[PDB]
C-alpha cells in the first residue's frame, strides 16, 4: 500500500494497542508490524486507502503519552 | 495478604490486561505477578482486603474469553 501510520511509545503501550486494534478493529487496517527500536518502540500500520486510515482514525483511540505521524509513500526502486 | 485473584487467558490477554490494570487501577490491588504457566497465562493478583478486591471487581472488566477466580488463602508455614 501507500498509506500508513507510524505509532510510537513505550515498548508494552505499543504492543498493547497493537493487540487491542488487532481484536477490535482488524477491518480498520491492512497490516501492522511487530515492535522495532531504532538501533522508544515503533510500529507501522498500514491502509488499503486514505478511507480506511480515516475510519480507523475516527474509531482507535491514541492513549495518553503514545504518538501517531500520518504517512503516504512511493516505491522509488 | 490473604485476598487473591487469578487471571487466565492468552499470553497476550493477560499481559494487555495487567498493563491496563496497572496503569488505569493501580489502587484497586495490591500486587501483581509477572506472567506464569504451568510447567493458559496465568497472573495473580493481591488484594488488601475483601473491600479493595469488591471494588477491583466493580472496575475492571473481566475480557471475552478471559477468566478469573478468587481466592482467600491462610499461611500454613
Known amino acids: 500500500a501507500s498509506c500508513f501510520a507510524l505509532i510510537s511509545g513505550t515498548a508494552n503501550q505499543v504492543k498493547c494497542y497493537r493487540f487491542r486494534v488487532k481484536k477490535n478493529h482488524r ?29 480507523f482514525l475516527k474509531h482507535v483511540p491514541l492513549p495518553p503519552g503514545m504518538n501517531i505521524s500520518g504517512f503516504t509513500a512511493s516505491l522509488d526502486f
Do not use: K
Open 27 to 55: 477491518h480498520r487496517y491492512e497490516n501492522c508490524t511487530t515492535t522495532w527500536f531504532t538501533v522508544q518502540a515503533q510500529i507501522l500500520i498500514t491502509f488499503g486507502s486514505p478511507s480506511q486510515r480515516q475510519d
